Symmetry: C3
Subunit: 165 residues, 3 copies
Amino acid sequence: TDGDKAFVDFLSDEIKEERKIQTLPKMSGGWELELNGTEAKLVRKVAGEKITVTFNINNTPNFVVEVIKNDDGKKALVLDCHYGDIFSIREVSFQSTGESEWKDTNYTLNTDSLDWALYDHLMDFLADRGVDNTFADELVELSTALEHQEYITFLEDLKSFVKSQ
Amino acid sequence: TDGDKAFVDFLSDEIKEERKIQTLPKMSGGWELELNGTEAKLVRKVAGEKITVTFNINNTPNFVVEVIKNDDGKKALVLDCHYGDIFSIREVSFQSTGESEWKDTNYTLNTDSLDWALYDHLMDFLADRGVDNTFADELVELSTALEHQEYITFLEDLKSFVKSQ
Amino acid sequence: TDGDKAFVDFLSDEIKEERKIQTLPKMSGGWELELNGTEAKLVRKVAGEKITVTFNINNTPNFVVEVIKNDDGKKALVLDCHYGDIFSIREVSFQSTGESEWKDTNYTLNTDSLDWALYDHLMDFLADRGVDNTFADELVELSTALEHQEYITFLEDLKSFVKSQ
């Protein structure tokens, strides 16, 4: 098709321009990064605790913190958080680790009009585990670089797709 | 951690205050209550019919009515309803009982601009089965008490979690 | 019940009125139609390509285009599209064919502020495969007729349900 091979030439140009524009920055705090396509996991084991921060660059942007007390590995404290605009906690609950789905029947603390004092203690709980406003600022730029890399990979996949046959 | 044990002391105070503030009221109509964490089920078997009202106190608040004609147990009439502000029916469809998921391919009657006459007959159909505005008012206070009990249980779980180690 | 048999008589009247008001139009372009209740699939195999347009009349209205290059059947280009108001592409990604779920970890091109030039090439890519504004206009009337047929079937199912016993 005329359109297809022109679309391929155009995608070639876009890939050059976006690579030229340019890598992944680091997170302070001894985190280890695990990439699964658009999903990133930052991991820290400290003092009988595993802390996992999970975000997906496809999506208001959010990240999920999972705190596992290694004494009792079946139930994790899960804190859904906003980042970018403001940091802030949106929801807290206990979940089974490694489930295919949030148990809808476990209680979820929505923070919408939450007592400022309980809210601040929750923020301090996160800060003590490394998830502070510095972490949230560093996450923005990691997320931003990761989105650009995956977008470039997508243009390549699209170019390869359209050029096949 | 300094913060952790202070967070525990604060949660201790909150648990006392919320229990002090204070149980589950009853539903008129011979309903039986089954609690699964934040999900409640109210059940009635009357005249060849099983009526199940399901709501989850995590979440505009809604409840689902499931009518099963005991002659043909495979397909249930499902009425998604709003409660609190106004009663009102939001959606009606037939679903297989005991499915893991709403069959997306079964027709769903959205009530958004629904003929008032069909709407009123649907309201009368529910009222005949006990789901009236009295039921919906009683549900608000049952839901409200159930949310408070589960929130108290959550503070205890949080306090226990943070205090461990 | 008094209400039930009156509801049955009323549903009888509604079914007559809606059938009286009146079938499924055709899609230009050699498409084959497969109905699964409220989900419709339009299918075309052309030049080493399978094109599938899927929409569900329950639901802003949208349809999904799936392009499979028969050389490599494991990954399909998926274009989520709006129809009715404007045509337009909302999201593009690669997905495994025949999955139970969108892989959340595959990159999704949201078109929200997308470069007009990449957007137009995507529109041309669809148009070359038959998904043009003519197709989208024809789809509106197919969807509209299909919703009416399924609604009539729903009134019959409701009438049959309420009349049983």
